[PDB]
């Protein structure tokens, strides 16, 4: 079962890079909503 999860692990390696670069990009989106007089971020 450890080497049947390898045939699908090519699909998970590229997926976790989209989850890495969408959370980086969301982090620069949160960085610019700070200077927008939003009183949530306090």
């Amino acid at each position: 079962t450890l080497q049947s999860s390898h045939i699908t692990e090519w699909l998970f390696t590229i997926h976790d890079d989209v989850k890495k670069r969408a959370l980086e990009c969301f982090l620069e989106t949160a960085k610019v909503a700070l200077k927008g007089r939003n009183k949530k971020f306090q």
């Binding site: 079962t1 080497q3 049947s4 045939i7």
Partner: protein, 45 residues
């Protein structure tokens, strides 16, 4: 007396044996291909 008897004839081709001949050959090559890469069925699981 064949017009009152002799059963009813079947137009039967034995392609079910010919379908098994190719399927037994498709299993053989997929095994043979697995050996030449060194990636067995136990390697894929």
């Amino acid at each position: 007396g064949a017009l009152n008897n002799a059963g009813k004839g079947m137009i039967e081709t034995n392609i079910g044996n010919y379908i098994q001949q190719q399927i037994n050959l498709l299993e053989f090559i997929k095994m043979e291909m697995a050996d030449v890469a060194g990636i067995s069925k136990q390697r894929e699981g």
